[PDB]
Design a protein around this ligand. Sequence first.
Ligand SMILES: N[C@@H](CCC(=O)N[C@@H](CS)C(=O)NCC(=O)O)C(=O)O
Ligand SMILES: N[C@@H](CCC(=O)N[C@@H](CS)C(=O)NCC(=O)O)C(=O)O
Ligand SMILES: [Ca+2]
Ligand SMILES: [Os+3]
Ligand SMILES: [Os+3]
Lengths: 240, 241
Amino acid sequence: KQITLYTATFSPYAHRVRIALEEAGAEYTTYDVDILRNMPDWFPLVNPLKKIPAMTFGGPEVPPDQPSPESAKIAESLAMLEFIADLFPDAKLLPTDPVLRARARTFMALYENYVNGQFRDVWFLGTPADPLLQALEMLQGALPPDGGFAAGEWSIADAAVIPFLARMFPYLEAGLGLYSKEDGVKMRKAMASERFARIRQYVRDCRARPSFANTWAGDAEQVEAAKTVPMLRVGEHHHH
Amino acid sequence: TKQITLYTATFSPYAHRVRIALEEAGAEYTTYDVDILRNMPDWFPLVNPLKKIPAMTFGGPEVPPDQPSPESAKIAESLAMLEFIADLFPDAKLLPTDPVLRARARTFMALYENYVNGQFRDVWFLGTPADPLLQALEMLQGALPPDGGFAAGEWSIADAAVIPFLARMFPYLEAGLGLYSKEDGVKMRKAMASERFARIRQYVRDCRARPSFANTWAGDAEQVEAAKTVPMLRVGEHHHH
Ligand SMILES: N[C@@H](CCC(=O)N[C@@H](CS)C(=O)NCC(=O)O)C(=O)O
Ligand SMILES: N[C@@H](CCC(=O)N[C@@H](CS)C(=O)NCC(=O)O)C(=O)O
Ligand SMILES: [Ca+2]
Ligand SMILES: [Os+3]
Ligand SMILES: [Os+3]
């Protein structure tokens, strides 16, 4: 059954699913959608929520811009990650041990419930960075301190999280986001300090896998794509 | 055979999720109440460093819940616990086996967590406008199978994730609990009784009728009283827009 992923280069949520599809060894199509500036009028047929990513599964082979009513329509990136693990059990995208699987699910929930909203506050509103650094230290603490991925072996938990952490460093270097230069310097200094050595190792380890290289446009190219995001307000910063 | 201990509180819809799943699994388990919002025990960070309910311990030697063992696995986050219980009890069929039906369950949980839950929190605790909550609830209702049944068809952990919040909404509205305005209270009570929301009313009745709900619910009046102990539900305060 065919897999089509509707994607966009700037989107960390879409990036999650591309990484998982690479790790699964899946056959799949990607189709870019200019969702924030010029959504195609047919896109609500694949996702009535009008969000990227969207996925179609099965149905007749059709061009991505002529989606079939017969394909299954799957929404929400984390549901897609679990779906890919279910479709490709031999790829071991989750552990088999229940406790190790729970480490993976807990890590995803920690990111979604405590970290992502802090990234949104800082990058979209320019609120103070300390709560974000606090949340990142908490997430770092859930990693195995001596090395490895969130659940030991690589799992969909790492697909869920690396798109956001990998964007953080080059976005900061570009000063992209509503935070002030002062908070930018503070974040860059903190993320380079020994306080965050472990999460730097995590980002390197995830980025070294082919699933990341094959789904990443390059730091400079990803920064340029992010500048097209309306809510990142390129050129704008809030102060105090 | 490994022991399960769930640290719980009657008001908490997040802990309620996990009690429902444990009932559906037929698991042997212990519950232990924790006064997390008014008087957290000094030992509680040993079972959850995030200092949130629910918390779960798994395995380790059998010990009293207020003397937790370092040897037990410490599991945090209610939705992680739901998937864990499905993993521990595969014969209970707490998820479908078909991948697309399983994705329906996972998508339903994500729709609730990402678009509905924050609206419930903001309307009840901050008194933000009710219309965005009603729109999110209409969207969630549209994900249900139209002719009846549960989120993924057969009952699954997706329904354990969602019913604690929907089941509290109706009696909380009737008891006037929450910081939203009188006007928005009237609007929500009318909407939730209107034909627009017939499908989600059937869904709530269907989930509540299962023994897993009856055996984990203190009764409407009792749950309302437990909710009044929540410090953020400041009696006599309302926000207006
Ligand atoms: N919870 C969703 C988030 C998806 C999301 O927010 N995608 C953004 C792009 S990064 C989008 O399409 N926004 C359009 C909109 O929200 O209207 C998921 O995990 O897939
Ligand atoms: N995302 C958590 C939410 C848990 C949560 O917020 N629990 C509340 C009780 S309903 C709590 O323990 N609050 C204490 C605190 O935030 O300090 C989960 O799904 O388990
Ligand atoms: Ca529908
Ligand atoms: Os975005
Ligand atoms: Os709470």
